[PDB]
A paper describes a structure:
DOCK8 is a Cdc42-specific guanine-nucleotide exchange factor that is essential for development and functions of various subsets of leukocytes in innate and acquired immune responses. We show that the DOCK homology region (DHR)-1 domain of DOCK8 binds specifically to phosphatidylinositol 4,5-bisphosphate (PI(4,5)P2) and is required for its recruitment to the plasma membrane. Structural and biochemical analyses reveal that DOCK8 DHR-1 domain consists of a C2 domain-like core with loops creating the upper surface pocket, where three basic residues are located for stereospecific recognition of phosphoinositides.
The crystal contained one protein molecule per asymmetric unit. The DOCK8 DHR-1 domain consists of a core structure adopting an anti-parallel β-sandwich with a C2 domain fold composed of a pair of four-stranded β-sheets, having a concave face called “β-groove” among C2 domains. The core is elaborated with two insertions between β2-β3, and β7-β8, and three loops (L1 through L3) that form a positively charged pocket on the upper surface. Notable distinction is found in the conformation of L1 to L3 loops and electrostatic surface potential of the upper surface pocket. In addition, the electrostatic surface potential of the upper surface pocket is less prominent in the DOCK8 DHR-1 domain.
Residue numbers in the entry: 557 to 736
Write the structure that this text describes.
């Protein structure tokens, strides 16, 4: 069946932590398209791998190329809601393997978060972004701000690498015909 849709395409390109103790292959990233700040606000809008198509609330990825073909790129494809508002945002959750866990464990745990409002300052947020990572948790009302400039919070936000941008993505909206 032939359909026409306006889709958001998100390319998680590079993750560049300064830590010589970790590598990007060991950081997992969860990607969600949110309509609000509550955990229940993940929209079922991400194209899955299956035919159908299936729509997911989240995808997990690791930004590394050592185990990929040279032609590889990660492409997250999102069915935009017909009406996009300031409440819609990409939400990224980072997971890592903490060193020297109890009993020698080697499971993954929450590292932090980043996000990108899709509409900010009356402009669609397409193009290239280098995003910082907020550690531990997100403050209320995070999603109306760019992660690069959040008002002072109480308790205060802590950022990876003193608020340096570490996560490179590209974002574009494309409306086209799909032959589902």
């Amino acid at each position: 069946h032939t359909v026409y849709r306006n889709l958001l395409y998100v390319y998680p390109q590079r993750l560049n932590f300064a830590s010589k103790l970790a590598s990007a292959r060991n950081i997992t990233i969860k990607i969600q398209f949110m309509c609000g700040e509550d955990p229940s606000n993940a929209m079922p809008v991400i194209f899955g791998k299956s035919s159908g198509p299936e729509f997911l609330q989240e995808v997990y990825t690791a930004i590394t190329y050592h185990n990929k073909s040279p032609d590889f790129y990660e492409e997250v494809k999102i069915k935009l809601p017909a009406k996009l508002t300031v409440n819609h945002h990409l939400l990224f959750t980072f997971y890592h393997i903490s060193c020297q866990q109890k009993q020698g464990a080697s499971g993954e745990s929450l590292l932090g978060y980043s996000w990108l409002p899709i509409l900010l300052n009356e402009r669609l947020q397409t193009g290239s972004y280098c995003l910082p990572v907020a550690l531990e948790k997100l403050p209320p009302n995070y999603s109306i701000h760019s992660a690069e400039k959040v008002p002072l919070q109480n308790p205060p936000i802590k950022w990876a690498e003193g608020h340096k941008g570490v996560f490179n993505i590209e974002v574009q909206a494309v409306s086209s015909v799909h032959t589902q």
